[PDB]
């Protein structure tokens, strides 16, 4: 009933041990077997069968406490996601080491224990460790929460260690997460790609449309920005001759937090010399179809799109995926023509009016790209939940770094894969002409002058590298935390990050 008193009592227990000799936090307990190795080694065992001649050293944490009297104690020992029962029988206690009840009366739920004992099955067939001696390695001073206590509470986030022990689903989630990354690292390695590291602190934060973080180095007396993307120095490396290059790492964007946006998230971006939009389309279908089959043995997975209570939709990752041109589909759904230039007063007022007619949010500032972006967000982004699908060939006012379309004026060779209306992949044929790049950086600075503080600044060091000749390349970005959300059936980005960014408890 009273956790504050429970913790105050256990604190006295630890100090009462030190006064009366014992050390409650010993340095080393040489373990002999792990609990998973234990279950494998002795699961194929008969009912009631003991092997009291094989003595083993095993560790773990107590998570269930019960007793069938003063002479038989029952526990649940967990370790590495698995579990065995501890069957402490008074007959098998090494009495030279201490009194049976005095030893086990101290055990509480959460205690980390070292056990010397032998393996066997119970009468009912429960595979158990049968201790000869049990020594406390690291006591748990607090009361562990119940599964109910964490269900719709933020303790999973602020106290992830509780979530990792109590909920089996949590360990499963993050084991899947690093399997997603393990797949992608080798998927690129087996294809001749070269993993690198580009700085996260920069004089200018380019590569995306987002407000950055700013820090300060004292000894240099220099203001550095946290990277919002890895796009530019990776393209500088293609110039350097590394024709197959990529990076898996954290990027930082100082903007709103919600179920799809954590301030720091993991991205992967690879750059592929002598590849284009089509290769990036085929790559995205190849990788996602194989990523999903690698984890599930199927191409169709089910996802609770509307939360856990409501029924799930089924997502079919089987290639090929639908391709939807952003301008012409917005055209069709709205029955209008977006005349070019898309950034003209006529086309901007037009889009303002169709945003106003449908009572959709007006973006501030009403830049032409944000109008198009909200139009695409409100009209084409949730077109398919049955499968992933590509929104392609964005106008050049939206894609300052994408190469212009080879047969469609004003558009780019850009693609974007969505799952359940959530952007998960960004790719395009790279804009490799320094003459046309400055015009998209100087037009972005004027967009910056209108209050669009996401409008990309002028990186000069990157512009100079374009002047030594960037070969025709194709680059693609992956939002890893979002891929993990869908592939682990979680509705929040806080559920696929170990320690998400939270409002402080003060």
Residues making contact with ligand D4U (CB under 6 A): 253, 255, 260-262, 265, 267, 423-426, 477-479, 481-482, 493
- Closest to ligand LYS by CB, 193 vs 428, is 428
Q: Of these partners, ligand D4U, a copy of itself, ligand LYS, none, which one is at the site of residue 1 (CB under 5 to 8 Å by kind)?
A: none
- Closest to ligand D4U by CB, 130 vs 265, is 265
Out of 61, 75, 128, 231, name the contact with ligand LYS by CB under 6 A: 231
Residues 430-459 that bind ligand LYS (CB under 6 A): 430
Helices 368-379 and 326-334, axial angle in degrees (round to 10): 70
Question: What separation in angstroms does the CA of 281 have from each of 138, 193, 286, 319, 417?
Answer: 53, 18, 9, 10, 9
Does the N-terminal peptide bond of residue 341 adopt cis geometry, omega within 30 degrees of 0?
Answer: yes
Binding mask 461-490 for ligand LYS (x = CB under 6 A): --------------xxx-------------
3 state DSSP class of 302:
strand
Shortest CB 477 distance to ligand D4U, Å = 3
Q: What is the enclosing helix (H) or strand (E) of 492?
A: none
Out of 136, 275, 424, 427, name the contact with ligand LYS by CB under 6 A: 427
How many Å apart are CA 164 and CA 156, to the nearest integer? 8
Q: Of these partners, a copy of itself, ligand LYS, ligand D4U, none, which one is at the site of residue 341 (CB under 5 to 8 Å by kind)?
A: none
- Closest to ligand D4U by CB, 255 vs 439, is 255
In DSSP notation, 130-145 reads EEEEEEEEE---SPPP
DSSP 494: G
Q: Is residue 343 part of the contact set for ligand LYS (CB under 6 A)? A: no
Q: Which residues contact 52 (CB under 8 A, 6 or more apart)?
A: 92, 118, 120, 130
Shortest CB 15 distance to ligand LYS, Å = 26
- Closest to ligand D4U by CB, 100 vs 283, is 283
* Side-chain half-sphere exposure of 150, counting CA atoms within 13 A: 21
Residues 190-229 that bind ligand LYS (CB under 6 A): 207-208, 229
Q: Is residue 184 part of the contact set for ligand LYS (CB under 6 A)? A: no
- Closest to ligand LYS by CB, 129 vs 208, is 208
- Closest to ligand D4U by CB, 163 vs 231, is 231
Residues 249-288 that bind ligand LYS (CB under 6 A): 269
Residue found by looking up tokens 């977006």 in the block: 338
Give the pair of three-digit tokens for residue 24: 């409650």
How many Å apart are CA 243 and CA 263, to the nearest integer? 31
- Closest to a copy of itself by CB, 1 vs 220, is 220
3-state secondary structure 260-292: CECCEEEEEEEEEECCCHHHHHHHHHHHHHHHH
């Amino acid at each position: 009933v009273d956790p504050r008193l429970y913790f105050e009592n256990r604190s006295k227990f630890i100090q009462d041990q030190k006064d009366k000799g014992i050390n409650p936090y010993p340095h080393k307990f040489e373990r002999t077997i792990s609990i998973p190795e234990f279950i494998e080694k002795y699961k194929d065992l008969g009912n009631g069968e003991h092997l009291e001649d094989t003595i083993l050293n095993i560790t773990g944490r107590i998570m269930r406490v019960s007793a069938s009297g003063q002479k038989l104690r029952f526990f649940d020992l967990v370790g590495d996601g698995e579990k065995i029962q501890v069957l402490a029988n008074y007959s098998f206690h090494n009495h030279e080491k201490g009194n049976f009840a005095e030893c086990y009366d101290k055990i509480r739920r959460g205690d980390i224990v070292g056990i010397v004992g032998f393996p066997g099955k119970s009468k009912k067939g429960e595979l158990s460790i049968f201790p000869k001696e049990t020594i406390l390695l690291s006591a748990c001073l607090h009361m562990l929460p119940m599964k109910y206590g964490l269900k719709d509470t933020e303790i999973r986030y602020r106290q992830r260690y509780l979530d990792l022990l109590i909920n089996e689903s949590s360990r499963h989630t993050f084991v899947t997460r690093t399997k997603i990354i393990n797949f992608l690292r080798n998927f690129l390695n087996e294809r001749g790609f070269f993993e690198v590291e580009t700085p996260m602190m920069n004089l200018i934060a380019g590569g995306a449309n987002a407000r950055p973080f700013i820090t300060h180095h004292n000894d240099l007396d220099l203001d550095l920005y946290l990277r919002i993307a890895t796009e530019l120095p990776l393209k500088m490396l293609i110039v350097g001759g590394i024709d197959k290059v990529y990076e898996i790492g954290k990027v930082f964007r100082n903007e709103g937090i919600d179920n799809t946006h954590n301030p720091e998230f993991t991205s992967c971006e690879f750059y592929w010399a002598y590849a284009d939009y089509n290769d990036l389309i085929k790559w995205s279908e190849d990788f996602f179809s194989q990523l999903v089959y690698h984890l599930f043995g199927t191409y169709k997975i089910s996802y609770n799109k509307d939360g856990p209570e409501n029924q799930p939709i089924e997502i079919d990752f089987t290639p090929p995926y639908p391709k939807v041109s952003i301008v012409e589909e917005i055209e069709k759904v709205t029955n209008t023509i977006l005349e070019q230039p898309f950034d003209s007063n006529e086309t901007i007022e037009k889009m303002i009016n169709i945003i106003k007619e449908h009572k959709i949010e007006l973006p501030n500032p009403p830049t032409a790209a944000k109008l198009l972006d909200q139009l695409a967000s409100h009209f084409i982004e949730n077109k398919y939940n049955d499968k992933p699908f590509f929104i392609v060939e964005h106008p050049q006012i939206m894609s300052p770094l994408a190469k212009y379309h080879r047969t469609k004026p004003g558009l780019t060779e850009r693609l974007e894969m969505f799952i359940c209306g959530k952007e998960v992949l960004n790719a395009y044929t790279e804009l490799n002409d320094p003459f046309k790049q400055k015009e998209c950086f100087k037009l972005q600075q004027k967009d910056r002058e209108k209050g669009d503080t996401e409008a990309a600044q002028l990186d000069s060091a990157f512009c100079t590298s374009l002047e030594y000749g960037l070969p025709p390349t194709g680059g693609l970005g992956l939002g890893i935390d979002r891929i993990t959300m869908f592939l682990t059936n979680k509705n929040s980005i806080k559920d696929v990050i170990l320690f998400p960014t939270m409002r402080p408890a003060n």
